[PDB]
Design a protein around this ligand. Structure first.
Ligand SMILES: Cc1cc(NC(=O)C(=O)N2C[C@@H](C)CC[C@@H]2c2ccc(O)cc2)cnc1N
Ligand SMILES: CSC[C@H]1O[C@@H](n2cnc3c(N)ncnc32)[C@H](O)[C@@H]1O
Ligand SMILES: [Cl-]
Ligand SMILES: [Cl-]
Lengths: 625, 301
């Protein structure tokens, strides 16, 4: 179903009106809190001394109704950015008055318009109201997709509408927001209600509002086409847009009167409900991850830390990845043990980070599928998990599997391995220290041994999400650097965001790394062609790995393994956002740094502007060895 | 309904009053008729009265029986006076605007009318067929005032919060035409056509400056700082060489000569001065209303 609201500017009887919108089928109501035409004076006698009441009473609805059903609207006569001093001062007072009454009623949200370039003093007044007593009040800025000025009919004889390609001119409306938002220093309390006019703009303009905090999408009854029967509908392009906004789960607001006078107000609402319920129903990935959207989480360190039962459980609850691991082994066996040698030759096969043993069970299924002998080690550092293995080893596997309970770096193995099998790959691949781990465990690999995987590779994409930028900025904690939260990565199901360039590869690792100058430290420069006027907030992190030959795993969206939920993207944010002009190159630099004990990333932006070097000397984020 | 919005004298000494409630439980509106113009605003000594669905923002006569309403609902309403002028029955109610209808104006003919709104659209109505002929999104902001040419139907003014003043002519392919002072002056608020020089008009701005404009010359010939605040309405006298009544949000009426100099000034109102009409019987009597529910009668030297 869809969360739908009715926008009115005329409310005769608030009891009746709200009674009607409810029956029509709306979840809430936007209404003016004071009468919209009832201008008020605060300075000049005799109008200031106007007898009250200034507005209808609070007792007209339950506190619940005010808290759940009513969105407040700033009266349209209030003009805090007027050129006229007196109108400013008066509008300032009126604006606080209406905001403060809104907060008195405990209203979920309050509406304010952007419909002009200079909204400075409006931001200033709101920013004050906000920074005046912490309160759950929410603010919907009403921003039009296309300026009124650029939508007007070309009917003015001496000021015509210019028919010349205006790339930045058609983005002007978003700059309004950006500036306002920026003056209010990225308040969590300030979102966008996006007003959608009859003529959509170019894709590239609608692409701007990706990664912007859209709590609402306003649809005037105008923009609706009329069909064969008489019902309201929308252009195929308007629909695509709705389907884009339904994925952000916006509240849909219906403004303007009923121009389909042969139906109800059901009609408009019902078309929306029909659109939403005939959308590509959720795939394996989307369905599983439906809670974790733009949810920041610290990246796991299965080395330094021991994972929990239910942590290991969701790793195992991913069938595709283990089919792939099983196949990968299946092939390697055949390639290694000739058909004729099948019974005379057993393979020494060592899982390195065996967890609760889904790779061990995969290693079994793979062997009897490929009819070759295997002896299994299951090396595991985490002694809580080792309990689970030894309980499998005893009950079901028997002495085929030899459960080893040490660090694969430490272990003094009895024989050498044909195949080592590791799953110790994070979301940026090398961010759990597979390279350091499998380097330490290399000395007991047979001189001709295979690693599964043998190659893995990390990928960065620049992204814009003032939303996720606000999520990270909200991770500041007492008793550490106040910006520390920007100098560390987060595993997040990136949702409300915008990819600005196609992912390029960052760091690649090989196993066995036979090189005599083994050095897992790195410096990779990346140059990202950008083709929009957007704002940089951080870098999406993905990975691909070769398990063995044509069997691979990827979370890199383009080559993404189908139906594989063991992994979400990582996100390297940056402190100050960076404006990027169209056709400019984003240059980001990455280092993999290491001493005896820690492994960390440092990262900087060198273009278009220079950023500050993030996480110098792993001071804000290290990975324990 | 304490907030009286419109005050229009008929061509027979009778008085029309348009009121909205801009506070309290109910945000409604009414239309009243007073065959005794000195007996207002008293509800008990009124010839005829009716409650609209919702408020009135602007109100004009449509001849001798007809009343044209700009409702907050977005509806333009036509109210036919009774056979015996005792009742005020709805002729038509037509929801064609998508916000408050802020202004209405009847065209020289009087079987057609224009209507400005807060949705930025202007519309031309057939009051006979009861449908919208034309729908024009000229402006970049909510339509402050529309005023029909007194003599030509196709021609009329609209001004708006986009700081534009548009001279219209519904006979062209590009009907609207942007005019006014040299630079972008403060916002226009009210538009009075000159009764006896259809070439010229006056516009009131938001900073209390009434200006005089010649369409021919398309240049600001004269302008005066009349009020401290916004100019909400401008009505010319039926006088041979007419006076100009300027309303304001500073709760003062001023009456001006042809050269825009202050003849009369009234502090009678203690809230906003909303509308004003001259008496067609005595041309030196002028009836102003306000949101103070006062109906003051001015004797104009
Ligand atoms: C096999 C493997 C797998 C992973 N996977 C992940 O990190 C990951 O994407 N997660 C997102 C979701 C599946 C919930 C579990 C986990 C998580 C939990 C909590 C936290 O704070 C950070 C991530 C990492 N490393 C390895 N080696
Ligand atoms: C299955 S996800 C990671 C698993 O690999 C194991 N692991 C990680 N690092 C090491 C290491 N250095 N030696 C042995 N096991 C490890 C952890 O105990 C965890 O079960
Ligand atoms: Cl609020
Ligand atoms: Cl596991």
């Amino acid at each position: 179903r869809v969360s739908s609201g009715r926008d009115l500017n005329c409310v005769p009887e608030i009891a009746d009106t709200l009674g009607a919108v409810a029956k029509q089928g709306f979840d809430f109501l936007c209404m003016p809190v004071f009468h919209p035409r009832f201008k008020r004076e605060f300075i000049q006698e005799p109008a200031k001394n106007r007898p009250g009441p200034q507005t209808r009473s609070d007792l007209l609805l339950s506190g619940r109704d005010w808290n759940t059903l009513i969105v407040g609207k700033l009266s349209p006569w209030i003009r805090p950015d007027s050129k006229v001093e007196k109108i400013r001062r008066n509008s300032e007072a009126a604006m606080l008055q209406e905001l403060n009454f809104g907060a008195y009623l405990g209203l979920p949200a309050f509406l304010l318009p952007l419909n002009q370039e200079d909204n400075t003093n409006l931001a200033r007044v709101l920013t004050n109201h906000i920074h005046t007593g912490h309160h759950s009040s929410m603010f919907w800025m009403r921003v039009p997709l296309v300026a009124p000025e650029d939508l007007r009919d070309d009917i003015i004889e001496n000021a015509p509408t210019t028919h010349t390609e205006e790339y930045s001119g058609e983005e002007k409306t978003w700059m309004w927001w950006h500036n306002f938002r920026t003056l209010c220093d990225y308040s969590k309390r300030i979102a966008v209600a996006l007003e959608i006019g009859a003529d959509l703009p170019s894709n590239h303009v609608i692409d701007r509002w990706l990664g912007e905090p859209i709590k609402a999408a306003i649809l005037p009854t105008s923009i609706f086409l009329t069909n064969k029967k008489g019902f309201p509908v929308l252009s195929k392009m308007h629909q695509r847009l709705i389907f884009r906004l339904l994925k952000l789960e916006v509240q849909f607001i219906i403004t303007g009167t009923n121009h389909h006078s042969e139906k109800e107000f059901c009609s408009y609402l019902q078309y929306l409900e029909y659109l939403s319920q005939n959308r590509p129903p959720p795939n394996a990935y989307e369905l599983f991850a439906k809670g974790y959207e733009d949810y920041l989480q610290s990246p796991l360190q299965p080395l330094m830390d021991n994972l929990e039962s239910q942590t290991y459980e969701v790793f195992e609850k991913d069938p595709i990845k283990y089919s792939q691991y099983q196949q990968a082994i299946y092939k390697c066996l055949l390639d290694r043990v000739p058909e004729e040698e099948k019974d005379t030759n057993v393979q020494v096969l060592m899982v390195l980070g065996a967890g609760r043993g889904p790779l061990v069970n995969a290693s079994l299924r793979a062997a009897k599928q490929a009819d070759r002998r295997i002896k299994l080690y299951a090396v595991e550092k985490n002694p809580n998990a080792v309990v689970t293995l030894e309980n499998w080893q005893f009950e079901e596997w028997g002495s085929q599997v030899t459960v080893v309970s040490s660090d694969m770096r430490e272990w003094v193995a009895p024989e050498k391995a044909d195949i080592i099998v590791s799953e110790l790959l994070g979301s940026f691949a090398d961010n759990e220290l597979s390279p350091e781990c499998l380097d330490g465990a290399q000395h007991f690999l047979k001189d001709d041994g295979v690693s599964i995987p043998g190659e893995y590779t990390s990928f960065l994409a620049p992204i814009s999400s003032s939303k996720l930028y606000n999520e990270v900025r909200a991770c500041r904690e007492k008793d550490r650097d106040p910006e520390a939260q920007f100098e560390m990565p987060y595993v997040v199901r990136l949702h409300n965001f915008h990819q600005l360039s196609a992912p390029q590869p960052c760091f690649t690792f090989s196993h066995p790394n036979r090189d005599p100058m083994i050095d897992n430290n790195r410096y990779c420069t990346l140059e990202f062609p950008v083709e929009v006027n957007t704002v940089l907030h951080g870098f999406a992190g993905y990975f691909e790995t070769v398990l063995y030959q044509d069997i691979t795993l990827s979370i890199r969206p383009e080559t993404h393994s189908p139906g594989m939920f063991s992994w979400f993207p990582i996100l390297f944010p940056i402190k100050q956002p960076i404006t990027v002009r169209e056709g400019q190159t984003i240059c980001v630099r990455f280092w993999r740094c290491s001493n005896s004990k820690k492994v960390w990333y440092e990262w900087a932006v060198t273009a278009p502007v220079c950023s500050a070097i993030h996480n110098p000397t792993g001071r804000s984020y290290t990975i324990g060895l | 309904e304490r907030q009286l919005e419109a005050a229009r004298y008929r061509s027979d000494g009778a008085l029309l009053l348009g009121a909205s409630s801009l506070s309290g439980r109910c945000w409604a509106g009414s239309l009243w008729l007073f065959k005794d113009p000195c007996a207002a605003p008293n509800e008990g000594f009124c010839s005829a009265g009716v409650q609209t669905e919702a408020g009135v923002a602007d109100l004009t006569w449509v001849g001798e029986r007809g009343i044209l309403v700009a409702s907050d609902s977005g509806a333009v309403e036509l109210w036919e006076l009774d056979e015996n002028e005792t009742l005020i029955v709805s002729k038509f109610c037509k929801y064609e605007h998508d916000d408050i209808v802020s202004t209405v104006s009847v065209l020289s003919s009087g079987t057609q009318a224009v209507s400005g709104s807060k949705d930025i659209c202007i519309k031309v109505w057939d009051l006979a067929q009861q449908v919208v002929l034309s729908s024009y999104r000229a402006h970049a902001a909510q339509v402050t005032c529309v005023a029909a040419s007194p003599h030509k139907d196709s021609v009329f003014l609209s001004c708006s919060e986009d700081n534009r003043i548009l001279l219209w002519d519904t006979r062209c392919p590009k009907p609207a035409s942007q005019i006014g002072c040299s630079a972008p002056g403060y916002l226009p608020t009210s538009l009075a056509w000159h009764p006896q020089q259809s070439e010229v008009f006056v516009f009131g701005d938001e900073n209390g400056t009434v200006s005089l404009v010649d369409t021919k010359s398309t240049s600001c010939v004269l302008s005066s700082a009349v009020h401290s605040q916004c100019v909400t309405g401008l009505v010319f006298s039926p006088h041979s060489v007419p006076f100009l009544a300027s309303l304001s949000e500073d709760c003062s009426l001023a009456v001006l000569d042809s050269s825009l100099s202050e003849l009369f000034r009234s502090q009678a109102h203690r809230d906003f001065v909303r509308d004003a009409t001259w008496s067609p019987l005595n041309h030196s009597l002028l009836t102003t209303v306000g949101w103070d529910h006062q109906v003051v009668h001015h004797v104009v030297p």
